[PDB]
Amino acid sequence: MGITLFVKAGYDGESIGNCPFSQRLFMILWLKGVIFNVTTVDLTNPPFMTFDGEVKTDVNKIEEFLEEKLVPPRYPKLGTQHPESNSAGNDVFAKFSAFIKNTKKDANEIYEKNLLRALKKLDSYLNSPLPDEIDADSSEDVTVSQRKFLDGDELTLADCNLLPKLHIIKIVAKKYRDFEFPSEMTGIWRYLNNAYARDEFTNTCPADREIEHAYSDAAKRMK
Template identity: 50%
Template structure:
């Protein structure tokens, strides 16, 4: 993480199975990525909701992670936090993370809802196949978007909006990671070969510390959706 230290920033994220490691929470990872991409110095604290420390309850009573303590001010509501960080940590010192193309914000916007409905449905339930098809349809839409040119001067791109990560990627990548990992571990679901746009997108993201280092362990994701309790290794 960068060394800019104009502000005192603490990000509180959901803790995992051992109450210390990174938990399965795409919304926590979303803010983790935003702050890392901004290049500002910040601290990360994992919070177990069942054993929330008294001092934390005093700081943000009734608030569950993720949330941000910014120069002593408690910030909740993820879209508002992003808006605040984008306006406060702004150019020229900090990079803008806003997409150039507005349609990038909408890419994959229904994917996580369709995935959640499918993954929570037991295999023997009659609507399981229908829910899976709806999830696959959303994957197909995202794959098509990634293969669609947004700029006449650029035939392909690394991320949703171009060759740099933006707020749109911070939103969809954590959800996509959860969906792909949980789908494989719980239902042996592999990303179809035809969705090579998504495969390349995830590969590009995993080459970046801002995404790779903020991901929970795969076992934490599986455990959240009913898999065996893991032996955590990733801590912050």
């Protein structure tokens, strides 16, 4: 009620800028179905939010606040039902940042292998069925999860945190390191295919040029 989300402005001064925390909060509010306005800021630090005139800062307190204040039946709970969903891929962005901010040719291999290692852990979580996912009477073979998202078939707070980060990695690492999520990471890709088909994810992504511009220091050759 009376909600505005203030997000980082882009390089142009007007567009939605690169910021995985702004996009997370944007996604949370959209997924709640609550009516809210969005305003970009040029320049305390975005993102922040006005909820009934009162200002809220800090992404996590805002997330906590929204989950506590926007409750069923008017608004869905978006908390995860499986704690592991909050840990899956929780190091991926950090390993990407180390990978992408590295300047030494000699260290790209380790950074890339550590990034790929973190991706494979997330890929496996997305191919491993969740508890209560598989019909008890199913056979005892290897079972690949067909669920849509991290925690089930619905987007949850875990997806809102992780997807902005996967998006940045996908765009930036391609642009500046010729790096792509390996096609044999079918779990990650099934997940991305499912997510990009949702307005809440696709339509809150900053333009590619914005994300690329934010990491333009990666264009310099490793030494």
